[PDB]
Amino acid sequence: GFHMPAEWEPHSQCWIGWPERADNWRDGAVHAQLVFTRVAAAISRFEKVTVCASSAQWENARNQLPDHVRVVEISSNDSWFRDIGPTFVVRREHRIAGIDWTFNSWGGLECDWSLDSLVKKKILDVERIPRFSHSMVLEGGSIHVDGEGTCITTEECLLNKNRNPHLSKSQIEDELKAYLGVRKVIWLPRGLYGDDDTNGHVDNMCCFVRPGAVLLSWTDDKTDPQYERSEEAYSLFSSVTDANGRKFEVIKLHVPGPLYMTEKEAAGVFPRLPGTRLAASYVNFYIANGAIIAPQFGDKKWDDEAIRVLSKTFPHHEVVGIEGSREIVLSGGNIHCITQQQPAI
Amino acid sequence: GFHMPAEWEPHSQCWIGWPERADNWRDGAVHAQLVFTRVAAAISRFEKVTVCASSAQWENARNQLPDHVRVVEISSNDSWFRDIGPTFVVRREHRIAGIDWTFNSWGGLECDWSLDSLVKKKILDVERIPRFSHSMVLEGGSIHVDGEGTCITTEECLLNKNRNPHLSKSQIEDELKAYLGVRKVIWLPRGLYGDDDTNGHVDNMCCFVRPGAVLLSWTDDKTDPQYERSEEAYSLFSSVTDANGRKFEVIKLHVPGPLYMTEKEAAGVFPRLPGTRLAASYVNFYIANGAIIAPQFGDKKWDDEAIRVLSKTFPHHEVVGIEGSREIVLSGGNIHCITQQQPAI
Ligand code: NA
Ligand code: NA
Ligand code: NA
Ligand code: NA
């Protein structure tokens, strides 16, 4: 009787990690920490925030973050709490639980994720919230829900042999149905071009706005490899209905750039290579209570256009652009990847 | 308008650390961890418990402790949360706060306590409880209160030049009055003989049973050096009144032994020396909601007598003796030293 509510439904708080590993974040994560502070501070205007830092980083996080953000000590390999935090479910006796999916470092065998694996159970232990363990590998960034019985995902990620090669698509779909409380799963073939680290997480490709409506990463440039992925997703959405028999409205959200890691950015990481195409999309935003917390990549034309489209799309939410989001995407993710909502009960 | 309530007043939870340092706990703390589990499990029958472990120990603590005990990650140098946890105060607007006294490793300059110093603020941050910082050095084990305006302490500890040599007795007393919400401080000259590590903490010498009544560490052996300390305290209690003008009832609680570290015990620590007299007293018990959690040192005569006296003294509480408490005292403390109550509001 539990289900995953939509991200726009009310939250009691948001969980965020704290970056530090010098081999993934340039210059010892100094720039990324400034942006994590900016994101946490912005979200905290709208809902309570907990930032989780290692022992070595706790004082730094506590100094940078404002007093009304809670700072706890939770050790991790890295700081992508969308994927390593628990996925909370509600039953409207316990009324909230967390799903502890198995983590495997985004298909990483094919190199240590043991601390990251413990993040789900540690957060649930802090909150004294029951844990539902699952042997299936899954990351929260790979699924999206409308809270009304529909889930969207990508085949590129969930059917990759680096995830659950013991399972067929039907078996995976049945676990999503049972654990997320959904009745229909929409399988986009592919996520964002260039998102090789996650194998095409849906949260970088498409998300719900409301039941029956999605934002879709888009480019008007038919010569760019993103075009065929976005067009294929657009065609799928235009050909199917949701779990309640609604047609989809699709709103295009144009990708920046393309953006590429510079020599200076790559040199700061102790592998991240000069010229690497960045997996950048404005779709990787977080919905906080009454707010959209949206990336800004330092590409003025597309940054301003994304704020315009998000403001029109979410007319009852305050849209907040976060300067410096390029510093998150240099390490492979964005605002949605670093957050995990806790639904209110 | 805040004051420290008595330890027998209702608690919302109890905070406990988790031992691990091989240079203070024999055999890598394996024996002490069994006893910390025993104490936490016993307290948890009566009130909620949080055990705080380092990243390296979190899984071990989580395995040993029962499911209804919360396990959080808080780093520390060592695990004496009576002295390194916050002292909570209540105002019956915020109704609870924590005092963050300065810690200095029990006068330790005259050798690293930087992580221990952060424990107070970390616990208050987890709970989102306001923090009152104090520049004065103080450990919670060095004071005891009745919740009705009286505090007892020792001169041996608080007037030692290794604590607050900038302050006179009057200045220290005024800080206790202001921060604990007390109107009279009773200064025992001395704590327990042999308690050189803490310089005679009151919690190993004497504690309140109820307003107007104390338990006092005692020996009938006039040849033992404890006798003159206990007799001096008995005479003081018999000569003064409390903050409300009550005379004191004194109940004697006979020390075990004396007990001495064995060669085998000392050899297990990676300094703790063979033959060291142990600073052992049954006074170092914890009052949980409706329970007395009391040491048992493996000295059958005095262990049984302590349970008899505590059961008579606290007729409305369940007395629970903890087997293996000698393993705590080998490292310089006991059940009261490893706990810190959080008062209910
Ligand atoms: Na701060
Ligand atoms: Na991958
Ligand atoms: Na356990
Ligand atoms: Na000392």
Numbering used by the authors:
A (entry chain A), B (entry chain A): 12 to 103, 112 to 129, 134 to 293, 300 to 374
How do the authors describe this structure?
Herein, we describe the structural characterization of AIH from Medicago truncatula (MtAIH), the model legume plant. The enzyme is responsible for the second step of the AGM pathway of PUT biosynthesis, that is the hydrolytic conversion of AGM to N-carbamoylputrescine (NCP) with the release of ammonia. AIH belongs to one of the seven types of guanidine-modifying enzymes (GMEs). It is a member of the pentein superfamily that is characterized by the propeller-like arrangement of five repeated motifs that form a narrow channel with a central, negatively charged core. The monomer of MtAIH is no different in this matter, i.e., five motif repeats (I–V) are arranged around fivefold pseudosymmetry axis that is aligned with the catalytic tunnel in the core of the protein.
